[PDB]
Curated annotation (Swiss-Prot):
The lineage of its organism: Eukaryota, Fungi, Dikarya, Ascomycota, Saccharomycotina. Associates with VAM7. Present with 414 molecules/cell in log phase SD medium. This is Syntaxin VAM3. Residues 6-26, 62-89 form a coiled coil.
Amino acid sequence: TNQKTKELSNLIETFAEQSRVLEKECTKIGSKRDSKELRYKIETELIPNCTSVRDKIESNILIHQNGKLSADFKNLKTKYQSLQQSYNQRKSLFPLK
């Protein structure tokens, strides 16, 4: 409703996308597309931006005030964590060469 909290959803809205992205880039990790540029883009562009997107959401106290939104990012950062883990492992099992 509020413009301030509205701006938060904009960050979350991206996180939500970045979330699917991580799982997207993570799904290809060690699978054909497996390329240094990918893992690099992932850790140097995706995750860094996804998590950075969190700090932006977490920075907005409205995230702690708004119960609904509070869960929004929480679900993203949460699901995002699973992605990094599922991929981080795969990346260790599917080395490039």
